[PDB]
Amino acid sequence: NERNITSEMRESFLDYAMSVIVARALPDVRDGLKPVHRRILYGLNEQGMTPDKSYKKSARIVGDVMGKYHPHGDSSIYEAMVRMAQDFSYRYPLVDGQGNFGSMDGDGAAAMRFTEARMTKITLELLRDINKDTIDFIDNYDGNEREPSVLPARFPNLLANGASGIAVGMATNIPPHNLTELINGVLSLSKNPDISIAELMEDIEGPDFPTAGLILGKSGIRRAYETGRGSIQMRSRAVIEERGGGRQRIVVTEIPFQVNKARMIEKIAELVRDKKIDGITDLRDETSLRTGVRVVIDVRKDANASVILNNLYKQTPLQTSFGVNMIALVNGRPKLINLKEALVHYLEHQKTVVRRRTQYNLRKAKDRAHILEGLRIALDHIDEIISTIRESDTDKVAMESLQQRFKLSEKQAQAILDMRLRRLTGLERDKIEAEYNELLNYISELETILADEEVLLQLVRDELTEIRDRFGDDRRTEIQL
Amino acid sequence: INERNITSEMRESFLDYAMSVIVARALPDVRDGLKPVHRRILYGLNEQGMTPDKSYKKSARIVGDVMGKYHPHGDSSIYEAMVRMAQDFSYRYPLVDGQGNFGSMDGDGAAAMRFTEARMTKITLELLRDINKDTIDFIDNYDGNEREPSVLPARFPNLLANGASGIAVGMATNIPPHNLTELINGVLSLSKNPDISIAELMEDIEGPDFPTAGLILGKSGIRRAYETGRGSIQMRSRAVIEERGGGRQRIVVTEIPFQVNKARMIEKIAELVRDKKIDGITDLRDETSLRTGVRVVIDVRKDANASVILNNLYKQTPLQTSFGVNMIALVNGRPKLINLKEALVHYLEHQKTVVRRRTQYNLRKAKDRAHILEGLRIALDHIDEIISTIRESDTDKVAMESLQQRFKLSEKQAQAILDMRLRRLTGLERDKIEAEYNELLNYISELETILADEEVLLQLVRDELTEIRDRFGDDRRTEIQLG
Amino acid sequence: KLADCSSKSPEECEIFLVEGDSAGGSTKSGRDSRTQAILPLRGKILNVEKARLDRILNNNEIRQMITAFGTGIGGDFDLAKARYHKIVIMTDADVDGAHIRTLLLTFFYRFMRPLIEAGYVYIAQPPTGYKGLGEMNADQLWETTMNPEHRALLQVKLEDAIEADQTFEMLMGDVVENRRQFIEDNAVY
Amino acid sequence: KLADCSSKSPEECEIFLVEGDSAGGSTKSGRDSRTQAILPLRGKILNVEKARLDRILNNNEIRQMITAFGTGIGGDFDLAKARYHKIVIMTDADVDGAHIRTLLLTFFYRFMRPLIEAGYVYIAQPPTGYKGLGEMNADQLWETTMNPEHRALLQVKLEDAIEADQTFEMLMGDVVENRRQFIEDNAVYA
DNA sequence: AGCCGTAG
DNA sequence: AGCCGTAG
DNA sequence: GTACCTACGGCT
DNA sequence: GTACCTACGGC
Ligand SMILES: [Mn+2]
Ligand SMILES: [Mn+2]
Ligand SMILES: [Mn+2]
Ligand SMILES: [Mn+2]
Ligand SMILES: [Mn+2]
């Protein structure tokens, strides 16, 4: 019929907004991922693109994701995937790429026709135990596939790699952190649910950007952590040295997070052309794969290069703010969270995942034990089994006779009919007894974990600690007072 | 040797590129009428199990597979090639089954490969039929991680049917499409007369049959093309002159020539009138819809010989176009200009080879099966000792060796037994074996007989061609008007 | 990128505004072409509540829409030169197709309100399955959305103009807080 | 799209002409930025054996190459104003890579023949294989083709002038028949 | 002419 | 002011 | 073969 | 979501 304009705007704009907040531009607090990422990673998984295997072309990988999970543009997906494989974008990179994946000069990647990708070993830890009923799968957009609602995420990905999303009516801006410090923060929290954010910052000293650099002071850090919002001052690593004959130069070896290096030098050369700064005679980019970032600024003779350094911090991105705005999806709705809350949520997720895996492990173990109980009955009375089968016309009559004669379940009787003649040799009989004995011991160990919450809790601690020891690394960003 | 004569580098480089384009890009194969991009796409749909009973797949995924697996080139090249194969106005017998916007006659570009879907047509099944019966020679792919076919089995004359066009180096190709019914009647005549003349063949194959219909003026150009492999064929649109009211008239066009753009042709007619290069045209319209098919209307000015206007329009517009026949294709992996008889000869030899190799495969396969069943009879007959032998044994190897010595079995019969499931010991399994075995021996006899005689093999090809001609054959569209 | 019909009688002429050049082609092909015109949009369009009227006139898509309709703007408008009596908004039945709708309604309200008032504005109802526009054949778009017989246009009616003003300035305006409050108020997860 | 080097010393400077924006990125990152410049080409370049002068001069590819070389063209060619004493051609090492090489050599012979005679023109030897330039990291391009101490560069020798003339005419000119006969004579379909 | 169709 | 990152 | 246009928030 | 540059041969 008809439609009021005002009612149509409210309905249509509200649908778009919610569809950008959830299901587009904000990360989930539990795995720290936005949908495109989660779909890329699940895809890499379900395609079996693990670190042991050779790379696959990105066009194939992006083709699968667009069609099975993510009904959007290939650009929106490759670009997202490119950022996941840049050591200067991601603090712990989730994709392992081959070919040109971009540089700090705002340098784009090569075409997806060319590059190839697989998982990293740490991505393995994101997806570990997903196929073991640890998280809930849901239907994809067309109902023709199933996708994860969240990933097992065996390390704190939200805080490790951070996030940025311009949503609608809100935004998020979360900085990367150091994995060793996060896990230790989680372990402290795990031992004292009432630990304070001040007490937690004894573990998490602050953000830790992939590009190293400096941080000025902890007043913005402590505000961000305790409230969710804070402003944090970043600076480059720059020293003053001599070049010969009393002349000095400035050497820059680390730049702020998310700053285009080429864009920054332009700004410097621009400020020089426009005479907005004094004392600069030369400016080169001496950067290479063999020496890393190196930007020199030659200083005019007998001129105070420290003064020039201090004015470059005022006038160039050499100094840059980061506006911490920690808004994540908690229970499917957006929320500005402090540090403790963000760790609390990730921990209750780990509890859930490990318990679910244990219960899944327990069910599958008892199923396989049940099957083997029947196989051993078959071995014990093989003469009678064969009689029983030879004496039957169909598969069904044989199945009914077995169930009846030997008190077997249907699954047991089926497992017997399906057995191959080869499984009757000396060694196959032994393998079956042996699998049984091991499975019994294993079942026992699983029930012990599910019998107590402290043993479960401790099991979580152990597995985190193992991850930390294997993947944890040194702080890069220096926090200067 | 860190130096290079500029003449030698240019010679070897250009020769490398020419040869590559000629034998691996722009020229079709005389056997299956297909170019490597096209062969890899079809082989891709098959290996992806994209048969027409399967629902449609994201084209992006298909092109992704093809690009990664067999065809290391621009995705735009692969997709556009896939597009053309799904267009009823490009392919006389279309090979791809498209779901989405796949273009129009106006040069309406098809939608992006994320927006389209696709699967095989029933007739591509006949292209790929018997691919996994050792009928054709497979080869390695570019990286050495795949196997791709060097030629499809092509159970109908695809080259002449859908035609080809390709710009290569040193040479280009332009083979028009044909009516399948005439082609098949042509191949059959050939198979009954190795010494058949081109005139006799043209009693079946009148001339090209374009998917766009239209007319062809005369059999002169056609005859030259079929005899020399080269010739010019005049394609004219289907226009009629009719009354539009009040003594006014109009020309109405309902079919245009092959490979002519409808919009661009209308530009030229509009341009002609605008620049006053043709008189008597009051209006021009394109009243084409889903419902009416094609319909271009040309309003003739009152008191103007609409037939003279019509004749000028043919003369000075794409309304009439020529087709430069230039039947070049790969024969033994070498470019050659072929007449119609050559093309039909090479195809029949392909079909003979295919059907021959399929039979040997089936023979070898049936023979292998029976050899298994014999091993199985003996097994079931002594099932009590079989098990004891298996039970008494420590390893598979020990089991196998005992079985063979004790029961006179080959290694592959002893394996077949060790793999057998307990449920095969049921009551009336002995009969299935006994039933299947005898049926097999029957089949074996049939196969060996086909290979015994050449005339029977050739008769088998004729029959399998006739089926296709009856299931897939269709009426001619293009009228060849004798004038 | 405009494709007009043949009839020069706006009473019967319709124009459809399609989302994306892919859908653009589809619709140009299946239409009636005698009374139906097509004009595609190359994705998300300008938001005219946030532009200082300087770049609005640099937007090629904006300029093309004015030209198509054959009227003017604001104080220089004329309803009687409107080349069509049905200006139909046709976008993907997904949330991005919705956003674009909102960006068009904003343009209409602040520039061609009399068209809303005249009821010359409509909204096409394409099959509300998951399948976008670019993914549909032409015959489907005809029968479901384009054919005057089977289709189902929604006509746009302008009511409390004061209320509409306040709505258009909350959802599309430069004050995020009021927008953020509206989301939180009316959020149905 | 040029990306030049630091040194103003032409003798030590080298310019790499690469295939594709895709590989241009990679080489831009793995080179010695002090003495090594880079200029990426979008696919197939113009074939100056068939094209007339107006079209050659409006072509941006050509333009960017003349400017970056700074020697001018034809009579105005001045070798003294060579900005690099090494112009290095770098393509995919497939059949299209070959073709692009022939086009570039045609341009140099007809418009900058002294560069060849002066030996300033080299051909890169990237690792042969199924992979092309766009599918390589920046380190594996340095270490194999741009690192002076590891790479192997083929210098382009011009000897018999008249033989080179007739060769370029035959392989690249507008007369197809001579091309066709050449292919037929030499085509070794292995 | 410039356009056919695989390539960069 | 414009740039960050998923979207059309 | 390679394009730039827009929305959205918050920071400068 | 563009405008689209190039080679190649035959009319
Ligand atoms: Mn884009
Ligand atoms: Mn017992
Ligand atoms: Mn392309
Ligand atoms: Mn959509
Ligand atoms: Mn290549």
Q: DSSP string covering B285-348, please?
A: EE--BTTTBS-EEEEEPSSS-HHHHHHHHHHHSTTEEEEEEE-EEESSSSEEE--HHHHHHHHH
**Nearest to residue A37, comparing CAs of A187, A147, A195, A139?**
A147
Q: Where are the beta strands (DSSP E) in A64-162?
A: 95-98, 116-119, 137-139, 146-148
Do the bridges between strand A146-148 and strand A137-139 make them parallel or antiparallel, or are there none, so unpaired?
Answer: antiparallel
B179 in Cβ contact with B445 (< 8 Å): no
Which 8-state DSSP code applies to residue B176?
-
**Nearest to residue B260, comparing CAs of B241, B233, B235?**
B235
Residue D94 designated active-site: yes
- Tell me which chain B residue has its CA closest to the CA of residue C29: B104
Which 8-state DSSP code applies to residue D74?
G
Residue B73: what residue type?
H
Which 8-state DSSP code applies to residue D138?
S
The tokens of A363 are what?
Answer: 């069910």
Q: Which of residues 40-79 of B touch strand E (CB under 7 A)?
A: 71-74, 76-78
Tally of helices (H runs) and strands (E runs) in chain B: 17, 18
Residue A207: what residue type?
P
Question: How far from chain centre, in Å, is Cα B475?
Answer: 19
Q: State the residue for tokens 């063209």.
A: D73
Residues 6 or more apart in contact with residue B134 via CB below 8 angstroms: B357, B358, B360, B361
**Nearest to residue B296, comparing CAs of B103, B91, B90, B106?**
B106
Gap between the terminal Cα atoms of chain B? 67
| Distance set, CA A71 to CA A141, A142, B83, B321 (Å) | 8, 9, 21, 44
B187 in Cβ contact with B179 (< 8 Å): no
Determine whether the distance from the CB of A76 to the nearest atom of strand F is below 7 Å. Answer: yes
Residues 6 or more apart in contact with residue A54 via CB below 8 angstroms: A118
Residue A459: what residue type?
L
CA distance C150 to chain B (A): 15
Determine whether the distance from the CB of B104 to the nearest atom of strand G is below 7 Å. Answer: no
C1' of H10 to CA of D90 (Å): 33
- Tell me which chain B residue has its CA closest to the CA of residue A418: B421
Question: How far from chain centre, in Å, is Cα D82?
Answer: 15
The tokens of A308 are what?
Answer: 């020039």
| Distance set, CA A384 to CA A389, A393, A402, A406, B170 (Å) | 9, 16, 10, 10, 80
- Considering only CB atoms, A63 lies closest to which of B64, B395, B419, namely B64
Residues 6 or more apart in contact with residue B63 via CB below 8 angstroms: A63, B75, B78, B79, B82, B113
**Nearest to residue A112, comparing CAs of A165, A183, A63, A48?**
A63
CA distance A375 to A409: 12
| Helical packing angle, A426-451 and A339-380, nearest 10° | 150
**Nearest to residue C135, comparing CAs of B111, B61, B87, A141?**
B111
> Could you say which residues from 326 to 385 on chain A have a Cβ atom under 8 Å away from some Cβ of chain B?
382, 385
**Nearest to residue B350, comparing CAs of B459, B236, B461, B202?**
B461
Do the bridges between strand A95-98 and strand A137-139 make them parallel or antiparallel, or are there none, so unpaired?
Answer: unpaired
State which H helix or E strand residue D123 sits in.
strand D121-123
By what technique were these coordinates determined? Answer: X-ray
Distance (Å) from CA A406 to ligand 2 centroid: 9
The tokens of B34 are what?
Answer: 């297909």
B212 in Cβ contact with B235 (< 8 Å): no
Which 8-state DSSP code applies to residue B276?
T
CA distance C89 to chain B (A): 20
Residue C54 designated active-site: no
Q: DSSP string covering D38-62, please?
A: EEEE-SSPP-TTTS-HHHHHH-HHH
The tokens of B469 are what?
Answer: 């001609």
| Helical packing angle, B36-47 and B59-69, nearest 10° | 110
Tally of helices (H runs) and strands (E runs) in chain A: 17, 18
**Nearest to residue A328, comparing CAs of A317, A319, A339, A320?**
A339
CA atoms within 13 A on the CB side of A342: 34
D185 in Cβ contact with B19 (< 8 Å): no
- Considering only CB atoms, A16 lies closest to which of C99, C123, C160, namely C99
Gap between the terminal Cα atoms of chain A? 67
CA distance C5 to C36: 6
Task: Return the SS3 of A11.
Answer: helix
Q: Is A59 on the interface with D (CB under 8 A)?
A: no
CA atoms within 13 A on the CB side of B45: 34
The tokens of A137 are what?
Answer: 């799968």
Question: How far from chain centre, in Å, is Cα A276?
Answer: 44
Residues 6 or more apart in contact with residue A400 via CB below 8 angstroms: none
Residues 6 or more apart in contact with residue B23 via CB below 8 angstroms: B330, B333, B334, B335, D189
Task: Return the SS3 of A419.
Answer: coil
Resolution at which this structure was determined, Å: 2.6
State which H helix or E strand residue A195 sits in.
none
Residues 6 or more apart in contact with residue C154 via CB below 8 angstroms: A1, A2, A3, C122, C123, C125
> Could you say which residues from 44 to 63 on chain A have a Cβ atom under 8 Å away from some Cβ of chain B?
56-57, 59-60, 62-63
Q: Which chains touch B (3 or more CB pairs under 8 A)?
A: A, C, D
* Partners of residue C171 in chain A, C-beta under 8 Å: 9-10, 13
* Partners of residue C116 in chain A, C-beta under 8 Å: 5
Encode burial over B295-317: b for 16+ CB neighbours within 10 A, e otherwise: ebbbbbeeeeebeebbebbbeeb
CA distance B146 to B152: 16
Residue B286: what residue type?
D
Determine whether the distance from the CB of B35 to the nearest atom of strand E is below 7 Å. Answer: yes
CA distance A408 to A46: 37
Which 8-state DSSP code applies to residue A23?
I
Gap between the terminal Cα atoms of chain C? 40
Q: Is B49 left (phi over 0), alpha (psi -120 to 50) or beta?
A: left
CA distance A127 to A151: 6
CA distance B375 to B411: 10
CA distance A170 to C96: 18
| Distance set, CA A148 to CA A351, A363, C119 (Å) | 18, 21, 46
Q: CB count, 10 Å around CB of C167?
A: 20
Residue B176: what residue type?
P
State which H helix or E strand residue A398 sits in.
helix A395-406
CA distance B262 to B259: 9
The beta-carbon contacts of B89-93 under 8 Å, at least 24 apart in sequence, are B89/B211, B89/B212, B90/B211, B91/B162, B91/B177, B91/B211, B92/B161, B92/B162, B92/B163, B92/B177, B92/B178, B92/B179, B92/B209, B92/B210, B92/B211, B93/B123, B93/B161, B93/B162, B93/B180, B93/B472
Q: Which chains touch D (3 or more CB pairs under 8 A)?
A: A, B
* Bases of chain E with protein Cβ within 7 A: 3-8
Distance (Å) from CA A69 to ligand 2 centroid: 52
Q: DSSP string covering C60-126, please?
A: HHHHHHHHHHT---GGG--GGG-S-SEEEEE--SSHHHHHHHHHHHHHHHHH-HHHHHTT-EEE---
* Bases of chain H with protein Cβ within 7 A: 1-3, 5-11
CA distance A434 to B316: 90
| Distance set, CA A109 to CA A75, A113, C69, D12, D141 (Å) | 12, 11, 42, 30, 16
* B483 burial level (CB within 10 Å; 0-12, 13-18, 19+): exposed
Which 8-state DSSP code applies to residue A110?
P
Do the bridges between strand C14-19 and strand C86-90 make them parallel or antiparallel, or are there none, so unpaired?
Answer: parallel
Residues 6 or more apart in contact with residue A339 via CB below 8 angstroms: A185, A197, A200, A201, A204, A225, A226, A326
| Distance set, CA B36 to CA B21, B68, B120, B150 (Å) | 11, 14, 17, 9
CA distance A161 to A144: 32
- Rounded to the nearest 5°, which phi and psi values hold at A116? -135, 155
The tokens of B190 are what?
Answer: 């050939």
Residues 6 or more apart in contact with residue B96 via CB below 8 angstroms: B41, B45, B82, B85, B86, B118, B119, B120, B121, B124
CA atoms within 13 A on the CB side of B386: 26
Q: Is A288 left (phi over 0), alpha (psi -120 to 50) or beta?
A: beta
CA distance A73 to A448: 49
Determine whether the distance from the CB of C100 to the nearest atom of strand G is below 7 Å. Answer: no
CA distance D102 to B208: 40
B207 in Cβ contact with B220 (< 8 Å): no
- List, in order of start, the domains of chain D with CATH numbers: 1-158 (3.40.50.670)
Do the bridges between strand B164-167 and strand B296-300 make them parallel or antiparallel, or are there none, so unpaired?
Answer: unpaired
| Angle value at C-alpha B39, between B33 and B45, nearest 5 degrees | 130
CA distance A136 to A31: 13
State which H helix or E strand residue D10 sits in.
none
**Nearest to residue C42, comparing CAs of C13, C22, C66?**
C22
Distance (Å) from CA A59 to ligand 3 centroid: 15
Question: How far from chain centre, in Å, is Cα A427?
Answer: 44
Q: Is B419 on the interface with A (CB under 8 A)?
A: yes
CA distance B285 to B270: 10
CA distance D71 to chain A (A): 26
Q: Is B399 on the interface with A (CB under 8 A)?
A: yes
Q: Where are the beta strands (DSSP E) in B127-258?
A: 138-140, 147-149, 164-167, 172-175, 215-217, 230-236, 238-245, 248-255
What are the boundaries of each domain within chain A?
Answer: 1-481
CA distance A459 to A356: 13
**Nearest to residue B220, comparing CAs of B325, B338, B342?**
B325
Gap between the terminal Cα atoms of chain D? 41
CA distance A147 to D135: 31
Q: Is D160 on the interface with B (CB under 8 A)?
A: yes
| Angle value at C-alpha B237, between B232 and B241, nearest 5 degrees | 140
Which 8-state DSSP code applies to residue B240?
E
Residues 6 or more apart in contact with residue B254 via CB below 8 angstroms: B238, B239, B240, B293, B294, B295
CA distance A362 to A365: 5
Return the closest nucleotide (C1') to the Cα of B35. E6
**Nearest to residue B99, comparing CAs of B54, B66, B163?**
B54
Residue C135: what residue type?
E
Distance (Å) from CA B20 to ligand 4 centroid: 42
Residues B422, A426: C-beta atoms closer than 8 Å: no
The beta-carbon contacts of B141-149 under 8 Å, at least 24 apart in sequence, are B141/B69, B141/B70, B142/B70, B142/B72, B142/D130, B143/D130, B144/D130, B146/B69, B146/B70, B148/B39, B148/B40, B148/B43, B148/B69, B148/B70, B149/B39, B149/B43
Residues 6 or more apart in contact with residue A8 via CB below 8 angstroms: C101, C105, C123, C156
CA distance C58 to B80: 34
| Angle value at C-alpha A192, between A188 and A195, nearest 5 degrees | 80
Q: Do chains D and C touch (3 or more CB pairs under 8 A)?
A: no
CA distance A264 to C101: 39
A385 in Cβ contact with A415 (< 8 Å): no
CA distance B167 to B165: 7
- Rounded to the nearest 5°, which phi and psi values hold at A137? -85, 155
Q: State the residue for tokens 């590891």.
A: D150
Determine whether the distance from the CB of A24 to the nearest atom of strand F is below 7 Å. Answer: yes
| Angle value at C-alpha B344, between B339 and B350, nearest 5 degrees | 130
